[PDB]
Amino acid sequence: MEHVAFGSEDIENTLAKMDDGQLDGLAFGAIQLDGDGNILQYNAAEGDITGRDPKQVIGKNFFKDVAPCTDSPEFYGKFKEGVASGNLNTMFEYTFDYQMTPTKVKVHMKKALSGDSYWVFVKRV
Numbered sequence: 001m002e003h004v005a006f007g008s009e010d011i012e013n014t015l016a017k018m019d020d021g022q023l024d025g026l027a028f029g030a031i032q033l034d035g036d037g038n039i040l041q042y043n044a045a046e047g048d049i050t051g052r053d054p055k056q057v058i059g060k061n062f063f064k065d066v067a068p069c070t071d072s073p074e075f076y077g078k079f080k081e082g083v084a085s086g087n088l089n090t091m092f093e094y095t096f097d098y099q100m101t102p103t104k105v106k107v108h109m110k111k112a113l114s115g116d117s118y119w120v121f122v123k124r125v
């Protein structure tokens, strides 16, 4: 594995510029989105939680295409407010339920260190 804990205070420094292969070594799901919600990175742990194939979802829009159940004030709303402000660091539980067995997760969205990039970290609860 890669030795990084969900919710660590400096997680954006540790994961910075991690390539796809190292991201697959994390204990929790990790998605990287651009400012519009398009998927830039998506690791194996997340695919194990949600059933999505990490290589097929890259390039899709998370909120419009892959995860409509997050198209809501409580998830996408928080994401888009953080993007617009250039600051994002929010943790909350949520239920993923689009075309899947409803799965309760803890979500941590945090602005990446690099440019037009935002992390969505996920673990089961």
Ligand SMILES: *C(=O)/C=C/c1ccc(O)cc1
Residues within 6 Å of the ligand: 046, 050, 052, 066, 067, 068, 069, 070, 095, 096, 097, 098
């Ligand atoms: C609800 O539509 C959520 C769907 C979803 C969440 C997270 C993923 O990695 C994939 C699909």
